[model samples]
Target: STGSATTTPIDSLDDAYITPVQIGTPAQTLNLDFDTGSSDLWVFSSETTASEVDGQTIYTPSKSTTAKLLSGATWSISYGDGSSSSGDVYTDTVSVGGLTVTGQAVESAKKVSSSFTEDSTIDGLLGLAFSTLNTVSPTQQKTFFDNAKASLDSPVFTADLGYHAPGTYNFGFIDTTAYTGSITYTAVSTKQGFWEWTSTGYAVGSGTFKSTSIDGIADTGTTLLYLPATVVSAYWAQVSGAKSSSSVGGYVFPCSATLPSFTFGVGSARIVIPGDYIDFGPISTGSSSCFGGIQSSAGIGINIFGDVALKAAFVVFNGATTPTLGFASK
Candidate 1:
């Protein structure tokens, strides 16, 4: 069996991509962020504190006949960005696209951080990372992909995120027509519970590719592409007006600057990100300076090849016993 779902950017800047998911016996639909960086399928629910329930949809377990509380089981998760949510656990029928999983662990949020409440675009998150990263205590639960892998024609999922358009997430089989040429495959290390891999190197614009190995994770949850400070500085230096700004909290340049394309190597294949993709957007409404989509990961312990990089190519997350990742031009 196979399933597919459409994911759309919530805003113009492509801050996050959201897909519709159905939960419970009665089928309550909520838009959720399919985050590959975390391992917790949590949602805003009736259990959430009233004050934290802004305009987001809430999942009510009492309405679902299949809902059963996992006694003594609770979960909590904090993201790299500092936002967090936590609550008790309930097993319910969960559906994404056309695939349904019975007895899926659905974390019902009792509390959420201010950032989540302020942004109403996403009701919760569906984590796609390894189950070893799950936060459920006493007993760890598998992700939707893990639970459904046996039924799938192939144990793999693909992410084809668009720059500003809607994209599709396909489970069980790869859409060969979605990509051009051949895919470049590489080994994935899930020891850290992430789609972690090492890139052969990177190049700024027309410059020569640097012969270096940069280890990073392909994170769909992160908004920006973060690389080493040296690499980030090299790219920004090409722009005449680019500068690290404390006021804007990142590297910014004149909105009219002609940015250079960024290229990173996977095995021998090179995925090129267009120059326009780096011109993130104005620092503020009607501002002359714009923030860069690529930033330095100096402080962050791990480098992240986030949405900014993922959108440039088609990505495959293979869940084989010996997991591997594949990248291709689209």
Candidate 2:
């Protein structure tokens, strides 16, 4: 029997899904974005400056009887999106779904960038990346999943991120009923605190999967799939009237343009992303132009298989021995 927990994601500004977790005694709940792109569990806390707090919920360590401050320890992290937060550290009981982790190191935010403050709905981030990426100074912190893995029947979790809807993050086990077809497995390397994997190749529309290899991260916190500039150009070339627009900061096409499904190669499996999902939506309200959900990872250093891509299939983050990603169409 795998020790498991299941939590539902709350739709957030159409960019991400926030999951709820309880920290400390009396169960103070906080909405967190389960981000695989990073490895730090930092939450808005009492240490956060009032002016920088905005409307986000704050987790008060002093109010929790079980909370203990980690003296002389601190953490700071910046994301690919330019958002960052810094804070002190605390050890406490953090629970998600039905699983509880004791002595988990939680970073309590004292400062946050505008990106985090403006997003009042999200209280913090629950990092799902490997523990190696934890940002605490002097000593690193182990993620809740890492601390609880040994007790789980299987060291794995399933990410079912749906489009513009609530999804589930199941810990320690796979829910067979959630996906169809066979689960395609691909090996992942976490050398950089990311779920980095290489895709054998990809196809534009109905084209065949090329032999080109792509190294990228399966990041749930990101909003769209980011590929190399060359790859992105080839994808848009197949779509009529699609061009990169500086104003919109991405490729745009006429709202009426028909799109082709994008396919990703994972070992022997080919996961298809329907064209409708490729068209993010109208550039603005009542506009005739639309934004392409796929973008260039030119400066980002690594490609991101973000929400736009993950929603196409049921993703499994298997943390047993060597980490691997298992995918199946939803």
Candidate 3:
């Protein structure tokens, strides 16, 4: 049977998409950020430092009759954005929508970084990456998606991330209604534990498509799109009053500016990103400065098509022998 779950946005223009997941015997539900960037299903729990657990809901292992400690097993994970969480492991019953997985590895966070602790909107992260990327020590753990895929009618899932609105994540089956137009499928390489793929080319606004290559991952956890510094500079040049501000730490432009649309090429499709989407609102509500949603991935070798890019299209993550990413205009 197929299972479907709704994704709620934490902020405007899809900063993060959260889904409710039930864990343990009686089913303690937690709103988890479905992140494709990392692999580790972790949550804030009683094991976490009391001071670190701000307004977030904490999971209690004692409350669950099915919770079992995986003796010696532990998990620690750090993200490219500097957010981190580490904890012990527990085998428990986990379910997303109607799909259930017994003996699922539930990592209970004993410690979390300031980034994670400050955001009370998310209880933890639900890793959607391949099981090979799981960070558990002593023994690796399979993700809920991996464990459920075998029993699923189809070993595929789709992420319908939207802009400042609720989206849907369909598992075991694809809901064509969630998106419009045909899905442009592109071959992807999962060698690095990420859905890493190369863009065939790109275009700045209405400009001609440039034959440039960009290697990057489809990161749902990240808020903005990242490209090389030169590419970022090229895009910013089109906008008047756009400058690199040390205080802003990125390209900042006037909030009233009309930005040219940006586009990225996949296998045979040119996915267009609107100009307004490029301007991620005002830097601050009272300020006329707006942060550019597209930034430089200088220090980080791999670029990222974060939520800003993902929201522009419906994404299909296929688990076929040749893992592929299918994109289509929403």
Candidate 4:
């Protein structure tokens, strides 16, 4: 089986991307964030506290005849940003694009942090990472991808994230038309429950490739590209008027500064991120200072190739018994 869905950036800054998912018997459509960094298919639901509910859509399990509560099951998760949610579990028919899983675990949120409640654009998260990271107690549940992989034409899913535009998430097969040239495959380490891979090196603008092994995860949920401080500093140094600022947080520079492009290697393939993609817009409304799309990952423990980087390439998450990642310029 194969399925394809459209994913779109929520705002002009490309803060986050969301894809529509259908859950339950009659299909309760909700726009969800497809996160590769976490493994918990959670959602805002009728069980969530009324005060925590804003204008976001909620999934009401009671409305679905096929919905069945997972007895004594519960889940809780906290993100790197400190946002958190917890809730009971239910098994229901869940569909992404056109792929369907009859008994997919659907975590119904009982409580959510202010950040989630305030963001009316996202209804929840559909974790695409390995199921090893699922948060449900007693019996951890499988992600929608895992459950559907066997029946798929290929045990893979591809992410085509766009810059302030609509993109696609394709399951089962890779759309050859979506990318340029051939894909470069690399080994993936699922030990940490992420689509983790090693990047051969990076180059700032048209500079020489440094040839340093940079290990990072391809995280669709995260907003920016984060690397070692050394690499991040090197990239920023090329931009005039750019500096690390505590007051403004992260590296910021004049909004009009001429930013250089960033390139990273996947095996022998080089994916180039345009200069404009690195200029993450102004720090504030009408402010001349702009926040960078790339930053240091020192505080995050691990480096992340987030939406900023993923938007520059076509990424394949191959879910074979021994998983591998494939990257191609798009």
What is the per-residue lDDT of model 3 for residues 1-330, given as tens digits with 9 covering 90 to 100?
677899899877466789999998798999999988888999999899999999887778889999999999999998888788898999999888888888999999999999988988899998888889999999999888888888888888888887778988888887888777899988788899888888888899889999877888988878889999999999999999999898988999998899998899887688888887787878887899989999999887789989888878889888876788889887
Q: Show pairs that collide, candidate 1.
A: none
Compose the digit string of candidate 4's lDDT tens values, residues 38-68.
Answer: 9999999999999999999999999999999
The numbered model that scores best in lDDT is 4
Better of 1 and 2 by TM-score: 1
Per-model TM-score versus the true fold: 0.98, 0.94, 0.96, 0.99
Number of clashes found in candidate 4: 0
Which pairs of residues collide in model 2?
none
Which should have the higher TM-score, number 2 or number 3?
A: 3
Estimate, for each residue in 237-284, the C-alpha lDDT of model 1 and write its tens digit.
Answer: 999989999888889999989999999989999999988878889999
Where does candidate 4 have its weakest 10-residue lDDT segment? 275-284
State how far residue 33 of model 4 sits from its true place (Å). 0.2
* lDDT, residue 155, candidate 2: 92
Q: Measured by C-alpha RMSD in angstroms, how accurate is candidate 3?
A: 1.3
How many Å off is the CA of 38 in candidate 1? 0.5
For candidate 2, the per-residue lDDT at 8 reads 42
Q: In candidate 4, how many Å is residue 305 off? A: 0.4
Better of 2 and 3 by lDDT: 3
